[PDB]
Amino acid sequence: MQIYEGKLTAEGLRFGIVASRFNHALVDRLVEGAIDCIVRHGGREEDITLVRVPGSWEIPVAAGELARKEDIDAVIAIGVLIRGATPHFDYIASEVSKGLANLSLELRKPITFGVITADTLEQAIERAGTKHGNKGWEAALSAIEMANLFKSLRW
Amino acid sequence: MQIYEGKLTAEGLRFGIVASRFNHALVDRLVEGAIDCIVRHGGREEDITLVRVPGSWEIPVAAGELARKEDIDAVIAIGVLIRGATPHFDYIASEVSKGLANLSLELRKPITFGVITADTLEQAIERAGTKHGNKGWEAALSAIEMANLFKSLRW
Amino acid sequence: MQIYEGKLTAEGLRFGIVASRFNHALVDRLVEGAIDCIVRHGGREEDITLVRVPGSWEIPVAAGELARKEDIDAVIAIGVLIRGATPHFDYIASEVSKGLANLSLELRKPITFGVITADTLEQAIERAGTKHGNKGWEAALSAIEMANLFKSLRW
Amino acid sequence: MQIYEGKLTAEGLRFGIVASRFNHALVDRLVEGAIDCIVRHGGREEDITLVRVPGSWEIPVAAGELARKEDIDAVIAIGVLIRGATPHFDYIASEVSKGLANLSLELRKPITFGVITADTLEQAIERAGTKHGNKGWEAALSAIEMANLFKSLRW
Amino acid sequence: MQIYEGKLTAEGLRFGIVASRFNHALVDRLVEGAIDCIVRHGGREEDITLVRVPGSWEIPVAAGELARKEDIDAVIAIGVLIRGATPHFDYIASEVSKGLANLSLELRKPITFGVITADTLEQAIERAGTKHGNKGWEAALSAIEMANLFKSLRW
Amino acid sequence: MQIYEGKLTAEGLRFGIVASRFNHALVDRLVEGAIDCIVRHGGREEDITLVRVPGSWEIPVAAGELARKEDIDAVIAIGVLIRGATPHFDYIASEVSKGLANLSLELRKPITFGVITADTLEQAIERAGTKHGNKGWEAALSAIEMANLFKSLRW
Amino acid sequence: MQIYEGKLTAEGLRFGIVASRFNHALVDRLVEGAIDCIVRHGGREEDITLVRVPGSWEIPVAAGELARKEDIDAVIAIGVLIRGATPHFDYIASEVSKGLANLSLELRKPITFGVITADTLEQAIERAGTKHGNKGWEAALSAIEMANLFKSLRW
Structure with missing residues (x-):
């Protein structure tokens, strides 16, 4: 059986983070988590690009600019949506998930x-x-594992 | 770490607004908010293009015409959907969010x-x-920040 | 400020696992988690020693034999205690935690x-x-981080 | 991977049992269970030493005398504590578990x-x-498995 | 099978009693019970040493002085803790049991x-x-049985 | 009467902090509190050593390495345990308190x-x-007062 | 960025305390707290001036006399108001807070x-x-930090 799996070493990998500014008291913790994860897995902090966008709505169009860069191995999209009084939350969470996907x-x-x-x-x-936990830390760790997996599936 | 972020100066930026006419008693307040935001951040009112459409349904096909203009830096899509008696609201809000996205x-x-x-x-x-608050004001402010961010990611 | 922290690379580290046999339907999943974690962080499977003991009670006296080995960098103690009808659970969980500690x-x-x-x-x-999650995976990841930290505090 | 595990053959192993006399109507069943387990796994009854103590409190200081004997491979500590009217049970069960541990x-x-x-x-x-079941039988079976495991970890 | 057990004859045995003074209306009954037990099992009253301490807290440090005497075969630690309004009882009963143990x-x-x-x-x-019953009487009887058992395990 | 007490000046004192990474959104606030306290009481930030460990469980074995350093006057052990669904919290909080103690x-x-x-x-x-309040700030302030007290009791 | 902050050393600082006599069983504890705080932060007790006034009402006119002294760096105003049967408490607490402010x-x-x-x-x-806690201790500690801050803002 051919088995392809991604290791968790981040050495040589180059990451984009797109993080929204709304709910920044929490998003700041998720971005800390993502960068900590990359650096402690052997990534260089100078091989991270962080893009700040005003809200979760704006994350996919910015992720699209980063993911089109040849020198970005994976993109980590980070935000916090909290349900409020109106159905707005439903529509933003629906569109950000579909857009990134x-x-x-x-x-x-x-x-x-x-x-x-x-x-x-x-x-x-x-x-x-x-x-x-920290879903910024988890998202970064998925990105490290997926970047390597892609590495091994191409060659 | 490379950090890209958009400043909130609107000088030299050119905006499209697409605003629906249904619920105009409220939409008129959101469009006031959007234009106030652009002008007080240093945008010129003569660099705003406002397109009126009959309802929220019509906003994405009109936004598509404005966003295809070379001289529009960002588009601000504005409307008011209020849930009524029937499931109609669900379908309009679903399609306008997906279309713009x-x-x-x-x-x-x-x-x-x-x-x-x-x-x-x-x-x-x-x-x-x-x-x-005014989500017209907030939408314009997102558009100012995103227009600049895009400026800085291209060059 | 002097900051000591452990990276998450397992290259060159040598691990002991002590895993109990009671509740093996679950403990087998935790030991899988621990070994997966070591191997995907760059540890060699041949640098893992696994000791099986009949129950959680027996884990500390076996961990004591492994931890006294010069060539073991960290020990991962694994088991499953599930509260039953009698106060027995309280006494086993109390003694295994104190013994390892x-x-x-x-x-x-x-x-x-x-x-x-x-x-x-x-x-x-x-x-x-x-x-x-898998607390076998988490325990192994703590052991990788602690083994490195100790490495850096000694030299 | 180095795997150490204890087989369940009791041939050549020498056991100590310390069994309390309080609740002897039940403890007598547990000691029967322990001896049956050793003998049917290939242990000789003449290689068992049984020490009777007046209560569960006395088991650790007696286990300490047996475990210091060079010719005892494992000790099986047996008793029955049943919760009564007062908090006494809590203190005896706490101290006997800690002492043996x-x-x-x-x-x-x-x-x-x-x-x-x-x-x-x-x-x-x-x-x-x-x-x-019989936790005397189970305790003896743990002792057989642990005695062998220790055998294999030393050599 | 080698069986070691302690007989209940107190002839030639030398005992220490440590008894607290708090709740003396009851502790006096327990010390009476302990001495009666020793004397009616064939112990001499002149081979008993009684140490009075102010409370249950003080029993282990005093028991430690008596148990270090070469000419004391067993120590009987006697007191009465009665739960009051505060959590104090929990902490004293925890520490006296652990200390003696x-x-x-x-x-x-x-x-x-x-x-x-x-x-x-x-x-x-x-x-x-x-x-x-009288747990002073029971404690003395355990001490008689344990002193003899130790006698027979040493020789 | 001889009175020994510790002043709250941190001048010349050298501190170790051991801080866990679990619940880092809060632990980061406690470590900020501890360092602020040391620095505003006249400690130098270069006389602080910070050790990060993966969880509260790991704090005592790391505190043990720092406290064995001749040039550390006091150790401040910092973490956050939050009770969950299982009895796990009870066992970690029991062992970390006992270990440090x-x-x-x-x-x-x-x-x-x-x-x-x-x-x-x-x-x-x-x-x-x-x-x-901030129990990181309080813990540091206890460490400043205890370091000085020890200073004055030795000489 | 220019940052001004007050350190917590009280060396060379000169304090006024105004403390009311009503509720003296508690106010005596707050004044103890305030003086302890000043002295253990390096203030001299001879650089404290304590003014006693009959009640909380009288604290601002007395604080006014102390604060007009050139050689007082900060004033600590101390009292205890406890709500009674009548609206009197509301009016005293309103006026003492406004007066000091x-x-x-x-x-x-x-x-x-x-x-x-x-x-x-x-x-x-x-x-x-x-x-x-002790709000006398806290008030003194605020006064130490504010006296220093003022020191650093003037020069």
Whole structure:
């Protein structure tokens, strides 16, 4: 059986992060998590490009610019959506997930989904570096594993 | 680390607004908010193009015409959907969000989502320049930040 | 400020695993998790020593034999305790935690605590490679980080 | 991968049993279970030493005398604690578990925990050779497996 | 099978009693019980040493002085703890049980636990020479049996 | 009367911090608190050594390495434990408190306990630099006072 | 960025305390806290001036006399108001807070607010050196930090 799997060494890999500014008190924790993950897996901080966008809505069109760069191995898309009073949350979370998902297929490139989609502020705090982990850290770790996997499937 | 971020100066930027006419008592407040935001951030009012369309359904096909113009840096899409008696609201809000989201990826251009999707008239009044802000103002401010970011990612 | 931290590369590190046989349907998943973690972080499988013991009670006296080996950098102690009808669970979980904790101080060596202490079978299934992760994987990852940290604090 | 595990043959192994006299109607069943297990796994009954102590409190200081004997391969500590009216049970079960646990680490020798710690008399009857097995039999079987494991880790 | 057990003759045995002064209305009954037990089993009253300490907290450090005497065969530690309004009871009962338990292992000498740990005054009265016996009498009887057992295990 | 007390000047004192990485969104606030406290009491930031460990479990074995350094006056041990679904929290909080407590006695050196042990995430947020203070700040301040006290008791 | 902050060394600083006599059983604890704080931060007790006034009402007119002294660096205003049966508490707490607040602006001098304003006696006991700290200690520590800050802003 041919088995392809990605190792978790980030040496030589070059990453893009697109992180939204809305809910920055939490998104700042997720971006810390993502960069920590890359650096402690052997990535260089100088091989990370961080793009800040005003909100989750803007993440896919910015991810599209980064993912089109030849020298980016994977993109980590980071944000925090918290459900409010209106149905707005439903529409943003629907479109950001679909947009990133489509780009990843179109450009044949890993784009990881480190976007918290929380019903409550408490849930969001749990997943941005407290008792349910850091989904920025998890998204970066997926991107490291996917970048290597792609490396090994091409050659 | 390479950091790309958009400043909030609108000097030299050229904007399209597409605003629906349904619920105009509120949409008029959102368009006021968007233009105020551009002008007080250093944009010229003569560098704004405003397109009026009959409803939220019509916003993406009109945004598509504006976003294809070489001399438009970002498009701000503005409307008000208020849930009624039938499931109609669900289908319009689904399609307008998907349509704008797709265009923004396809044409590689910021299209901001200043469309209120409110369960109630009271909620819509709150978000069209009363106690929960003006999402026309917020959408314009996202468009200013995204236009500059794109400027800096191309060069 | 002097900062010491452990990287997550397992290259050149040599690990002991002590895993209990009681609840083996779950412990087998935790040991899979631990070995996967070591190997995908750059450890060699031939640099892992696995010791099987009959139950959680027996883990500390076996961990003590492995941790006394000069050529073991860290020990990963793995088991599953599930609360039953009697107070027995309380006493085993108390003694295994205290025993491992004491050894780690006495022998000045990382011994990680990959022992699930679950009130219910459902909780144990969640933490042995389903919806709350794999604490074998987490324990191994702590051991990789602690082995390196110790490396850097000695020299 | 180096794998160390203990087989279940008791040939040539020499065992100590320390069994308390309180609750002897049940402890007698556990000691029967322990001796049956050793003999049917190929141990000689003449290679078993049985020490009787007045209660569970006295088991660790007696286990300490047996475990210090060069010609004892493992010690099986057996008793029955049943919760009564006062908090006494909590303190005895806490100290007997801690005492045995410490000795096993200190003397680097298997000491198995065949001590029932039951909330009710019915629970104790279940675990002393009726519908939930015999924890004397289980403790002896752990001691056989641990004695062999230690054999294989030393040489 | 080698069987070691302690007979209940106290002839020639030399005992230490450490008894606390708090709750002396009951502790006086337990010390009476302990001395009666030794004397009616053939011990001489002149071969008993009684040490009084102010409370249960002080029993282990005093038991430590008695147990270090070459001419003391066993120590009987006696007191009464009755749960009050505060969590204090929990901490004293925890430390006195652990302290005595540790000494007995360290000095390789029987130290029996005749300390009542009662939720209520009524429970304490029951166990200090009324309807649930005398735990001073029981503690002395354990000490007689353990002293002899140790006699027979050394030679 | 001889009175020994520690002043709160940190001039010339050299500190170790051991801080866990689990719950880093809060632990980062506690470490900020600890360093702020040292620096504003007259400590030099270059006389602080910070050791990061993967979790609270790992804090005592790392604190043991720092506290054995001749040039460390006190160690500040920092983490956040938040009770979850299983009894795991009980066992980690029990062992980290016991481990640090033992080291401090063994090495005759202040090791302060800045470990939050919270039933809820809200409680943990309160004690990591909001409405119930910063226990990192408090732990550092204890370490400053204890380091000086030790200074004055030796000479 | 220019950053001004006050260190917590009290060396060379000269303090006024104004403390009310009503509720003196608690206010005596707050004044102890304030003086302890100054002295253990390196202040001389001979550089403290303590003014006693009959009640909280009288604190601002007395603070005004102390704050007008050239040789006072900060004033610490201390009292205890406990809500009673009538609306009197509301009016005293309103006027003492406003009076001190105004003086501090008028004379351009730190006046710290160590006045407990408790609904209940139990709350007041908590904040005058039991489980919620000592607000005399906290007020003094604010005064030390503010005196230094003012030092650094003038030169």
